[PDB]
Design a protein around this nucleic acid. Structure first.
Ligand SMILES: [Mg+2]
Ligand SMILES: [Mg+2]
Ligand SMILES: [Mg+2]
Ligand SMILES: [Mg+2]
Ligand SMILES: [Mg+2]
Ligand SMILES: [Mg+2]
Ligand SMILES: [Mg+2]
Ligand SMILES: [Mg+2]
Ligand SMILES: [Mg+2]
Ligand SMILES: [Mg+2]
Ligand SMILES: [Mg+2]
Ligand SMILES: [Mg+2]
Ligand SMILES: [Mg+2]
Ligand SMILES: [Mg+2]
Ligand SMILES: [Mg+2]
Ligand SMILES: [Mg+2]
Ligand SMILES: [Mg+2]
Ligand SMILES: [Mg+2]
Ligand SMILES: [Mg+2]
Ligand SMILES: [Mg+2]
Ligand SMILES: [Mg+2]
Ligand SMILES: [Mg+2]
Ligand SMILES: [Mg+2]
Ligand SMILES: [Mg+2]
Ligand SMILES: [Mg+2]
Ligand SMILES: [Mg+2]
Ligand SMILES: [Mg+2]
Ligand SMILES: [Mg+2]
Lengths: 82, 122, 85, 80
RNA sequence: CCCGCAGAAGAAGCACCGGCUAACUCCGUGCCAGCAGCCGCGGUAAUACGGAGGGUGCAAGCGUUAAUCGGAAUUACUGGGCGUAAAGCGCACGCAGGCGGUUUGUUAAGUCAGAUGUGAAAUCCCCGGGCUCAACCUGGGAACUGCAUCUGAUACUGGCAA
RNA sequence: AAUUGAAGAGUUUGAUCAUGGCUCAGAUUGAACGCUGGCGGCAGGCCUAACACAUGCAAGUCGAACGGUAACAGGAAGAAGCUUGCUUCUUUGCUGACGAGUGGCGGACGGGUGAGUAAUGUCUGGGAAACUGCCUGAUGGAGGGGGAUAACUACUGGAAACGGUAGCUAAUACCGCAUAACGUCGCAAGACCAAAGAGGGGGACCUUCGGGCCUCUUGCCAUCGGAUGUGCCCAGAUGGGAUUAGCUAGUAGGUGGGGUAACGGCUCACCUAGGCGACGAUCCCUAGCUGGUCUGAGAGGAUGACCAGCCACACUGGAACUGAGACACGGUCCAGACUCCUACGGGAGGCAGCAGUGGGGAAUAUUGCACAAUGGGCGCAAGCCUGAUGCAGCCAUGCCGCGUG
């Protein structure tokens, strides 16, 4: 079944994840279906640090995708509407 | 029952396929080798990357023969062909590491224990 | 080779024998049908079909011939029998 | 039609085993001159009807044989 | 990452200097020992060998070797040649193939136009953002010069006709 | 805003211009060696022998499917260590838990490699005849029976690997029987197919005090969808050679039978006599393809490590079984090559997973740490597993920064 998860395109000691929808069986940084956000956990308090096209995530969870554990947090941490 | 001119098959991974006996060792004027005796052989034909080349001259112990072997009750074990296992000249002892086809317990010879240990049958 | 799912090896044999028998018995009842068609007996031909239909449909359900494989067989047989029955 | 092909006949002499020539011009990918790159196709035509020299319209069907993935649609012209 | 502590304290090498090519003298040697990417240096004043002083070049690297492309328009499509320098077959006839005067009509394959879809992400590039800088990491664009489908345009080329 | 970028020199001659090779300045490298060598950040690290491999580790998990107790942990009617509340053994699986076994799901992923393959490949663009585990929408299912068996017990053969008898037992193992439509065959009439339970808490009421009953959860069966994955067909493109010009009998097509999840010479029988080929078949040689990488002003030339996609292989040749998926990387079977064990009768094994070793070479690293993160398997969960991964160690191998004042 398809899934929403973090690919780790970071860089030793300063991780920076892509968040992707893909066949759960593939590699954590391998073939995916589409990209649907990102999540810099070193965001720094400056500006940005967790952009996340919700209305797609939506779409796939409609089509049956499961979500990670971390991602699930981020969504319920983006809040949702504000 | 082998003698000079007799061809033999090979019961090991020596690389020799066909050998000839050019001598029956073990006694002046001695005609036959059989059972499990040591013979001197020349190599009539061998595979292309074996432990031995054709034309090589060394010893071997006969381990299978058409004439076979009698046992202390009268029975006989007879083989469809004659086979020997190549040995190194200044040591007897087998040049190969694997043995093929059955052999007889007559080889209980100390120096041929590896030959029984290996080898499928009897 | 040494790893738990040695178990799997011995398992797939239990399975294999199971399916082997039901797989034969099935193609037997299938044979009985093509037999009558080659014979000429339209009745035994229908008689054969009506006893094999369930066991095919049935096997499929159980899943050693899953779906359409059955279908084809019925379809085929049905044509044959009333081709001259 | 989801696309169609034209082409002359080239060979009719075989129980529906019709093969058709197709002709394109193409710019040589290296020296720019335009040359004739021909294509032959093995097409089905039930009850054999075209004849060597006929222009014919053709369409891509599923496999009718190891070789055949095209039936014909219409004929055009004859007695070349 | 931050604060204190001691004391310049632990921390410079390699190739080159005849021309190409940035950098010159002396001593030794004497067609020897030897150098050399190419030219070519060495037989008594060697800026070319070896050493030394000085200098030039690079620096935790520096040289040598190997390897791709470049300069090479030296396989020339863009972008070359064959009288005498490499190169016109000894001559002809001709199949395939390439090319083909001039007119009108038709076709719409080559050609041209538009629309749609597709051209994975990374990479490259532009504008930013984050690690003290940079390498590195990242947002977003741009680009992927391509392919196909549909509809059109008919001057040129191809097809058909006369 | 976003490819807006192009240089020449040395050397045939006494000298010259031309012709023409040789050479040089530049970028680039998974590099090696020689001299030298201070620190850090990111990266790279067997290019050779798809050579051969010692040892550890690289796939398990679920007691909320099942009978269960062998280990250690408690508790227990009751027997006790007794220093009368602190507690010892007989036992008792009573539950916390759990070796072994049955069962379930995963061992088809992740990770390795480039051998074979000039096309069951790859890239581009398309097509019709198919299946699709877990996840998800919809609609109903989930009745009632049966015979087994491992474990275990006894006896017994082996040095070991691992067996032989006889019993004995549970289930989400297995099979009938029912039920059967918007499913399958069928123009129709008709005919035909399925399943499994397990927990959590709970008012009466009460039961053989185990539970019914209520209640929610989770799994189980069927049909049609989705989603994804995969199978298949067409066209173009994707190395070289004529000192290779002819190739082809399942060959090309048809008809029918069979077959596959599916179209199909896929297979067969019979018929037609076709099919390919100088727009390069056949034969031979070499080769995984791509995105892209280097270079070049471009056009090109060269290239396919590291990252991502596809294919292919898993000691060599061949096979199939299980399964939704394999003709299976740490599965099975046969043959082979080769290695290990042995009490000599017989057994066992495959690093192109990680590290490591021998060998080859000019040359390429530690038998490290951790599941903390991310990702994967299983579990309601807690968790367990994870050489994927995240880190660390080694080498100036490269890039970048900095210092040695
Ligand atoms: Mg049929
Ligand atoms: Mg100068
Ligand atoms: Mg010098
Ligand atoms: Mg001097
Ligand atoms: Mg050039
Ligand atoms: Mg010229
Ligand atoms: Mg000349
Ligand atoms: Mg002439
Ligand atoms: Mg004209
Ligand atoms: Mg892209
Ligand atoms: Mg900055
Ligand atoms: Mg015209
Ligand atoms: Mg001169
Ligand atoms: Mg050193
Ligand atoms: Mg257990
Ligand atoms: Mg190869
Ligand atoms: Mg069942
Ligand atoms: Mg029924
Ligand atoms: Mg039941
Ligand atoms: Mg057919
Ligand atoms: Mg150029
Ligand atoms: Mg790798
Ligand atoms: Mg195999
Ligand atoms: Mg199967
Ligand atoms: Mg292995
Ligand atoms: Mg290893
Ligand atoms: Mg060595
Ligand atoms: Mg690793």
């Amino acid at each position: 079944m398809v899934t929403i998860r973090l690919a780790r395109h970071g860089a030793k000691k300063r991780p920076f994840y892509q968040v992707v929808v893909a066949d759960s069986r593939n590699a954590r940084n391998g073939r995916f279906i589409e990209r649907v956000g990102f999540f810099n956990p070193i965001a720094s308090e400056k500006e940005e640090g967790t952009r996340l096209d919700l209305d797609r995530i939506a779409h796939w969870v409609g089509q049956g995708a499961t979500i990670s554990d971390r991602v699930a947090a981020l969504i319920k941490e983006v809040n949702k509407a504000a | 029952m082998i003698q000079e001119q007799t061809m033999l098959n090979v019961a090991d991974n020596s690389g020799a396929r066909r050998v000839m006996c050019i001598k029956v060792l073990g006694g002046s004027h001695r005609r036959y080798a059989g059972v499990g005796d040591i013979i001197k052989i020349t190599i009539k034909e061998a595979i292309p990357r074996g432990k031995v080349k054709k034309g090589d001259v060394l010893k071997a112990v006969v381990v299978r023969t058409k004439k076979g072997v009698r046992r202390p009750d009268g029975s006989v074990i007879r083989f469809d062909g004659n086979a020997c296992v190549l040995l190194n000249n200044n040591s007897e002892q087998p040049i190969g590491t694997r043995i093929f086809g059955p052999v007889t317990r007559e080889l209980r010879s100390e120096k041929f224990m590896k030959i029984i240990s290996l080898a499928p049958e009897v | 080779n040494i790893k738990s799912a040695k178990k799997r090896a011995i398992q797939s044999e239990k399975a294999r024998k199971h399916n082997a028998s039901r797989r034969s018995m099935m193609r037997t009842f299938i044979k009985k049908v093509y037999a009558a068609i080659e014979a000429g007996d339209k009745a035994a031909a229908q008689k054969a079909f009506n006893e094999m239909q369930p066991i095919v449909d049935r096997q499929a359900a159980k899943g050693l011939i899953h779906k359409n494989k059955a279908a084809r067989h019925k379809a085929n047989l049905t044509a044959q029998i009333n081709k001259l029955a | 039609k989801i696309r169609t092909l034209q082409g002359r006949v080239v060979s009719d002499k075989m129980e529906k085993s019709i093969v058709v020539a197709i002709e394109r011009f193409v710019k040589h990918p290296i020296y720019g001159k335009f040359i004739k790159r021909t294509t032959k196709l093995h097409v089905h035509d039930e009850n054999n009807e075209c004849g060597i020299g006929d222009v014919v319209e053709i369409r891509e069907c599923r496999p009718l044989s190891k070789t055949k993935s095209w039936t014909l649609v219409r004929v055009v012209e004859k007695a070349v």
